[PDB]
Amino acid sequence: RILDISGQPFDFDDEMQSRSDELAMVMKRTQEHPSSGVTPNRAAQMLRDAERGDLTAQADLAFDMEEKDTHLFSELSKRRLAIQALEWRIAPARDASAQEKKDADMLNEYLHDAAWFEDALFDAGDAILKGYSMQEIEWGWLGKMRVPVALHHRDPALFCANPDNLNELRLRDASYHGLELQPFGWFMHRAKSRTGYVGTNGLVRTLIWPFIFKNYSVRDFAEFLEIYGLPMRVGKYPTGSTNREKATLMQAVMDIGRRAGGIIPMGMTLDFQSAADGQSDPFMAMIGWAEKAISKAILGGTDEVRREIRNADVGQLARSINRDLIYPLLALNSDSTIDINRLPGIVFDTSEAGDITALSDAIPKLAAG
Amino acid sequence: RVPVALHHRDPALFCANPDNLNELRLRDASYHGLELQPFGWFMHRAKSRTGYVGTNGLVRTLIWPFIFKNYSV
């Protein structure tokens, strides 16, 4: 039996938990769009439900926001590209033995040789907006070595938090208690932007309101622009007019454009009344305020703060990788028990690039000693 | 054995498998499309946003500003 990281023995099954016939029904889902006609009460209810462990409506709302809002998508893409551009290397523990160094370098070489690692990291970046990111693991054989063939992303809406114990995710199976996650078969990465339980640490909680304000303002602005700068044309006719005479007047009113002429009787009158007036200053002011609020929420400014954000979420991702992927590989490949405090980890190249021009000052120091 | 030439194809002639998303198939007026012929296609997809295929393109976010700009102009 394979020994867990916590020290509790268990049985390892290569088949996915989602491949079960009974679970096949819940796998197929229709992606509802709760962003149509958003109401502050509706958003508050969705957030309240997500607090208790629903996590479905909030996930769909976050998906809708990440595609409907251009600024939010741009900022998220910028952040994910910034985190993805870093370089990583596997290093063993301090004062490591020769065998430990050999294992560390072989794992490092394998992970650079693994194509699915980049996709796995990119998919794990989804926990910046959503509260969590869940990916399957497809175990396989490569030269008598247990390695993952590929990792499959899963919809965040298919997971619910345990009411008895929060901060623990479970697979939804239409039951009071969801199915426990299959050990050595999942890659769960969560980003704790704010302290608290899972499902409340995502960026959706703070970004729901500016999105609503900005979208409503822009749609109202577009509607106002539609009926702007074209006054309505009206025509007054005497009470004794024939039914046919009204039709001719109605057709004549509809035929006004460019440099138009026309003759009207003394009894009839024609006037122009504007159906909309105002300026675009308030709509644009609100849109700009919402956009800068979103930019402040995501990036921290409208740089050093970007570097700190990258360091923090890179460290969180490294901890998640060490907890989820590094240990099972060694545990399955090695027959003996894996030491808990002597396992290799992943270190990202989080170092500021030096300036070769200003490091010429080291020569006098080297001469002095 | 080398490829003589590669011919681009209309993206509208492909449909995703309802049983298993993220997999493209050639449309043939059937519930399940024809599976792609091995060693006969060059399929490149850009994952701008995570999720299933057909939702990771730039159309999803660029549809609205295009509408607003064109109607305004």
UniProtKB/Swiss-Prot annotation, chain B:
Processing after translation: Cleavage by the viral I protease yields a C-terminally cleaved portal protein competent for DNA packaging and procpasid maturation.
UniProt-annotated location(s): Virion; Host cytoplasm
Disulfide topology: none
Protein's job: Forms the portal vertex of the capsid. This portal plays critical roles in head assembly, genome packaging, neck/tail attachment, and genome ejection. The portal protein multimerizes as a single ring-shaped homododecamer arranged around a central channel. Binds to the terminase subunits to form the packaging machine. Acts as a linker between the capsid and tail. Required for attachment of the neck proteins to the capsid.
Subunit structure and binding partners: Homododecamer. Part of the immature prohead complex. Might interact with viral I protease; this interaction gives rise to an early 25S initiator complex. The scaffolding protein Z and the capsid protein T should then be added to this initiator complex to yield the immature prohead. Host GroEL and GroES are also essential for the correct assembly of viral head and tail.
Induction: Expressed in the late phase of the viral replicative cycle. Expression of late genes is activated by the viral late transcription activator C.
Protein name: Portal protein
Organism superkingdom: Viruses
